[PDB]
Amino acid sequence: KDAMKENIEAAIAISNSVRSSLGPRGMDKMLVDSLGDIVITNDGVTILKEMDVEHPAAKMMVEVSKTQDSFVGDGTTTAVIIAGGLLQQAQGLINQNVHPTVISEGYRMASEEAKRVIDEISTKIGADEKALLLKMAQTSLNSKSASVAKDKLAEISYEAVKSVAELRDGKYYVDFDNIQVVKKQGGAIDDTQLINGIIVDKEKVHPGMPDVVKDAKIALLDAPLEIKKPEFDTNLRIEDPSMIQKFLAQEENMLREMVDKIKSVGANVVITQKGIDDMAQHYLSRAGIYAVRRVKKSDMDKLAKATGASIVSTIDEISSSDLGTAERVEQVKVGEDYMTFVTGCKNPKAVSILVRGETEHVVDEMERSITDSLHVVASALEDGAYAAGGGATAAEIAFRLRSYAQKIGGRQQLAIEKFADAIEEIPRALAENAGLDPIDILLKLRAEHAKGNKTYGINVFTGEIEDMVKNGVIEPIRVGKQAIESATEAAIMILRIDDVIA
Amino acid sequence: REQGKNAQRNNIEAAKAIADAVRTTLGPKGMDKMLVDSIGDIIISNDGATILKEMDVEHPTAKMIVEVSKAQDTAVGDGTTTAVVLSGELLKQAETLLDQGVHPTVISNGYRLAVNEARKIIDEIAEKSTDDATLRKIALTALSGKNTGLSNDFLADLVVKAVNAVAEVRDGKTIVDTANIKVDKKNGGSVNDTQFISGIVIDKEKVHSKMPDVVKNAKIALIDSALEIKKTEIEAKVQISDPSKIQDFLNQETNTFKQMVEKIKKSGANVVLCQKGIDDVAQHYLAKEGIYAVRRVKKSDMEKLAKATGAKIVTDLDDLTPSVLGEAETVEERKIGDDRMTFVMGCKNPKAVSILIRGGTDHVVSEVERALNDAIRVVAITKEDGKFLWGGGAVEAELAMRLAKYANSVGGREQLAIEAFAKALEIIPRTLAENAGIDPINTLIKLKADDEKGRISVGVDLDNNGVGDMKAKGVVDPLRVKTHALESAVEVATMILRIDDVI
């Protein structure tokens, strides 16, 4: 009774915290943690993963966010909005003594039917792959502050994924470990660019290394270049004053030989995850080797795939077969800093996006906003179909669920219809956020959809219920199915819990 | 946590405040602020970025406005006050459009339109010129509201000269790596005593008294390592079983330092600049050899020196061959003030110079340095861009006039938004005036008309006590600074405008 009432409310609360960010008239959130760290964003997953939620139900609603984010990438604000709907609706049904088991089944059945509908009303991406995908990329950018440059960012998002996308069984596959995305402040948004290669935010380890190497043999280590001290308690015993220099020379030789090995195998560049001893640094430098250090592991992998290298952790056995390849490696100043660009990679299905923003917190959102597009054009590409956005498909699923409800009649039907009303949350939010009258738009929305206008959504700019695919607001089918999936799974969980104790 | 109206108006209120904190430092008749911490203490400056980096901002939103000064500074050098004041005004002007019902987003879209548009008008009305004559002008203006004395013309000239002495030309365009200009300072009272050294100055003394007071036609060896007794990475112990050996071991040490010095002499090097330490026995023999050595040289410097003299930074003295030694006609220690400093002049590479700043107090030298940097940065930019703008409210007044016209040629809501950006731009003229102590409103009224009649270059003439021809007075704003200021401001203003709930 109460545990439930309390849970449902706590949950709905989180939903609302995110509702206002849905769509093109979406608003953003400012989040300041304990440490005073500020995150000003629109990305609902971030807003959620960020906020300080305590109520267990609230944590469960947030569990939704991350999961929707995980599988698809776009639609976490959507998933949350629906989970609140379903919960707020079940709240009504619960008052009429409808058993939470009935509500859970009904919700489950409606959900199933909802995904079917999306498949039905979906549309295979035809030969318009280019402009279709572009239209998708843009709609994504429309909610984010990146809208400012949605045209350029969308082209970049489209270009980047198209590049790393392998069309195998007449079907595409996109490995994101082929798209390196870096953010560097001190440039306008429009300045964001696509760099064929893998940019690493690291400069050469020593003043004397060259600023550019052409036709580079990239040696990738996952071990530091330093003298190896044995595993056993080892001690040097000097009884003759002469031995002192002999020992010191031997230690320098060991390092001078590590460099020799890497060099002997034809390595031109040495990118290591670990540290490079200062003396070893001298040697590489002297050998004319461009070497970076303490590089990010994630980056290490990307350089691997790109250059066809192998991450050697046993320098003594670094073979020529272990060398990556790139047309040229060069240190370039990206504004204030110096970055290392490995261009002309052996594997051309590897590319980088350099997000530019005048300010830290600005470029940070810019980076989040783009990742959202990538995930979209990618998810779309893979799926192969798309659905009309702007609440059209929601209004559609809402429409079809009211029918199915009449078929699978009973108390089940009450739950199925509420599920419909809940899905309608999207059009309401979208309208609300712009300024449109929810109840009026929703009524007109229902009309058109009743009359079989499966693509009539809310053009939040004109306030009219137009053709969403026409005006170009479209989204990958994958986004919609999960949101409804993650959303109903939260509602059902919270809905079975009749007591919460410690 | 604050939602909607509360959050927003509150946010605009925050930005506005931080923005006024620096407002009075704008322009010639600017004032200074005095920030005092807990230990270091008193810092007195006119620099926008400084007054803010040092300022203890608490409110998140205010911290964001501060971010633009740090960016403006590190990215473009001049304009930190402007970008802050402007962000404050765009957020403020928006608060009206907000109350009327206009949606934050469309406002954000108006600012886009507006700024993108202004980003063209200025580039349209920008005035090309790269002659020292105007480079000197950019300088004079960059040093205005700052406490530099009456020497500005002298300082302007040093800057133009330093920039020109390091400006290189590549595939047709001129590049000016400001890193080749080493600026330093030393308390000695003067400001006029600011020397322009055609070389690299190092705030360091020679390590040992008997070392040559000066070295002509110097072969310079830059050393990464410390000329000291090193120990093997694997723990070692020495077991003496014979009393005799106790001395032998003490000698190995000596003979070790002797050889280090020997390697150095063998290379031909007569000047040793060591990034790390130097042992007293090493010093004994470097001196005996007559080599001018300097220890614990700053890596930053080790690098400039490497570049200026053409030397290679070597760690292992075994790879200290004549091939990696740098060149300088003279390496001489000279007492600048209370301090002795090492002067490296006649470097193999001429595109490396210094500006040894003098001035007294201490508090005066630091700021004069800060002023000279703004000047160096903008003169450099201008050297590359070859374009500039009419200073003192001029550019703004024009942009405002044109933008208010472009506004009409735009939709309903967005127009309102762009008219707002037009007004925000007038904040600069108004400010320069206010500080000067003149009448904002009339100044603006008069400035509008003159610019309207086509007088692009009529700015706020503090001398004429009102408006005037900036062309004549030679007040010129570098292009790159205006644009980054405008773009930075719009991006950050938009960021804050969308925040409807702060938690």
Add this chain to the structure above:
Amino acid sequence: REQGKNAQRNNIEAAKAIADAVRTTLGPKGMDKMLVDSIGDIIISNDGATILKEMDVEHPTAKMIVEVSKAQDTAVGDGTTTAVVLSGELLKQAETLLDQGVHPTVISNGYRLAVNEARKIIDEIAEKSTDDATLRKIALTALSGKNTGLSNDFLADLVVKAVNAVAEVRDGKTIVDTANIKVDKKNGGSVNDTQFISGIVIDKEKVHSKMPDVVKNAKIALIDSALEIKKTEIEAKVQISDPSKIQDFLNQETNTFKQMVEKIKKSGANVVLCQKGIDDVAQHYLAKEGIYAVRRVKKSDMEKLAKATGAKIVTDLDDLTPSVLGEAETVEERKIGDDRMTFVMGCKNPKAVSILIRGGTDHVVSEVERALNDAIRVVAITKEDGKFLWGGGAVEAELAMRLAKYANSVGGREQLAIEAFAKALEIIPRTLAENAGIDPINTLIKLKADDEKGRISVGVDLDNNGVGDMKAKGVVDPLRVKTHALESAVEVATMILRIDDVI
């Protein structure tokens, strides 16, 4: 204590706040507020003055804005919300002119110019008419955002009728003393049961059961004194020395009351309305005489009754002659609700009527009364003035359009000031819209153009969901209310604007 900017912006902030507290009660789609004290308790109203008199305002400046509602109310009856909202907007709009540098005084002079000007345009564009047809219209509109039910047409009609029944004509002009209209209320559920009594109603019962339930062709005596045993001003004591006298003294008392009653009967009076008490023995004989008496009648009433029936209020029953008795065809007690009340109908003087308000709850009757009063006051004014204006943002939109034009024909600073007053006037349309839930900005945009094309009467049409022709809908604002609202607002806005230091 607060000086300058602090004080001012702070003051404008205060006024603005108190002003928004009532903002949502404006117009038809208005809302109500619920004020709760410590004992009496819950008060739910839509009335501007009420929500504020009862509101616990602390800030001085806010107390001043409250003063205008109380004035607007007692001086003109309708418009209390408007005058408050308007003062808030004039102070708010000024805050911009202030920041730009304009001096509070010149702003105060702009508002003078502007208001004086508007005070002419309206009187120029005012629409004359005194027919019941429009008097009824003034009524309907005065009852809008209030919780009166669906009966408004019925209520409007009662009001028009009451006003017309008491409106007198003197040297050519019509006068309507609202004091001749006695409004009362009684919980009984209905609102339609609101009776229009062509006479005076007194919430009082006859003092004694045996008194006539009704009195036809009544000779009414109004009495100032209490029909009770009076004591001599100089302390008295009665010394009984004989047991017999103890009774005699008890009889004097009785015979005293008998005579009081006798004096009353002798005058011809058959109805006695006593402002004070009546003794049980006096009651015995008044009843025995068959006189209808009522005690402790409210002085307010004693006065209306005197005026309605033509009776003279007498204190000394010795001066109770037939000459000072009032007349009424019928004086009858009738049970209205749970309460018994005394109905005095057929008064010698017809220009005296009542409106016995019914409605249920209690909270609903009080407000319906408050609504009926606004209606009574404005219908009355309009009856006298014979002029009116186009309601629902219309008048304002026009004034704003014309005033922005007049602004150009004025100086530099003052223009800015009058353009500010023009915008402040648009606050009403925007408000009506906002509350209705429609789009302020577009509504305004559309409303401007239609009024610009000469459509004076296009107001904010909540029904048409936007703009519309108020002429048709019959939404009319009485003249006197607009003007006092405007004048009150300007005087108080100016007062606050000059305060540069609050201590």
